[PDB]
A paper describes a structure:
The recently discovered Aortic Preferentially Expressed Protein-1 (APEG-1) may serve as a sensitive marker for vascular SMC differentiation. APEG-1 is expressed in differentiated vascular SMC in vivo and was found to be down-regulated rapidly in de-differentiated vascular SMC in vitro and in injured arteries in vivo. The amino acid sequence of APEG-1 (SwissProt Q15772) defines a single Ig-like domain. The structure of APEG-1 shows the intermediate set (I set) immunoglobulin superfamily fold which consists of a β-sandwich forming a central hydrophobic core.
Good quality crystals that were suitable for X-ray crystallographic studies were obtained following the truncation of the 14 N-terminal amino acids of APEG-1, a region predicted to be disordered. The X-ray structure of ΔAPEG-1 was determined and was refined to sub-atomic resolution (0.96 Å). The main hydrophobic core of the domain is formed around the aromatic residues W53, F22 and Y91. A disulfide linkage is normally present in extracellular immunoglobulin domains between strands B and F. In ΔAPEG-1 this is replaced by hydrophobic interactions between residues I41 and C93 in strands B and F, respectively. Only one cysteine of this bridge is present in ΔAPEG-1 and no disulfide linkages were found. The RGD motif folds into a 310 helix that is involved in the formation of a homodimer in the crystal which is mainly stabilized by salt bridges. The homodimer with the largest buried surface area utilizes end-to-end packing with the subunits' N-termini pointing in opposite directions. The residues involved in formation of this dimer are exclusively located within the loop cluster between strands CC', C'D and EF which lie close to the C-terminus and within the 310 helix which contains the RGD motif. The dimer interface includes two buried bi-dentate salt bridges – involving the RGD motif – between R65-D87 and R65'-D87' (the apostrophe denotes the adjacent ΔAPEG-1 molecule). An average dimer dissociation constant of Kd = 20 μM derived from the concentration-dependent Mw measurements was obtained for both full-length APEG-1 and ΔAPEG-1 at 100 mM NaCl, demonstrating the nearly identical amount of dimers.
Numbering used by the authors:
A (entry chain A), B (entry chain A): 17 to 112
C-alpha cells in the first residue's frame, strides 16, 4: 500500500501553433491512483483533439493535436488514491 | 467603389464546453473586402476544428467545433480593401 507519488512530473514546454503536444507523467501508488488533468484549475474536457491516455508502468499522458494559442496555460496533474493525494504542475506556452 | 463597412457585426456569446460556435459578420465594400480573424489580437490559425468561411452576400463566419475553455477571448474581424479598413470585436466566453 502506498499513496500517490510522481516518479516523472510535468515540465514547462513552449510549442508552435500547429504542433502536437504531449504532457507525460509517471505515477506510483497502490491501489493505482486515479489521475486527472486540469488547465488553469478547471477540468480538461476531452474532445477529438485533446484527450488523456493511460499506458503501462503508470505513464499518464495528455495529448493535444495541432496546438492553438488558447491551449497555453498552467496544467495540473492530480493523482488520488485511498491513502493520499498528490499533484504537479507546469506551463504550456504556444508560439506563432 | 466603397470602403469596407459592417452591415452585421460581431456580438458577445457565452457557450458551454463541447458546443459548436459560429461568429458571423456581413461586410460590404467594392472591391470585396479581405476579411481576417484575430483572437486577443493574434491571427486565428485554422485547423480542422476552427476555420473561416466566406458565403454569399458578404457573409463571413468563424466556426469553432466543440468549444474548449481556451477558445474564450476577444475576437476581432478585420476588413480591408483599396479604399479603407474597418474592424469590429466581441467576446466569447465558455462555461463548463
Amino acid at each position: 500500500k502506498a499513496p500517490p507519488t510522481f516518479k516523472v512530473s510535468l515540465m514547462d514546454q513552449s510549442v508552435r501553433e500547429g504542433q502536437d503536444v504531449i504532457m507525460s507523467i509517471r505515477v506510483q501508488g497502490e491501489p493505482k491512483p486515479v489521475v486527472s488533468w486540469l488547465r488553469n484549475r478547471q477540468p480538461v474536457r476531452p474532445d477529438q483533439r485533446r484527450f488523456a491516455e493511460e499506458a503501462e508502468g503508470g505513464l499518464c499522458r495528455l495529448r493535444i493535436l495541432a496546438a492553438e494559442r488558447g491551449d497555453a496555460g498552467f496544467y495540473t496533474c492530480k493523482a488520488v488514491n485511498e491513502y493520499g493525494a498528490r499533484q504537479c504542475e507546469a506551463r504550456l506556452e504556444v508560439r506563432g
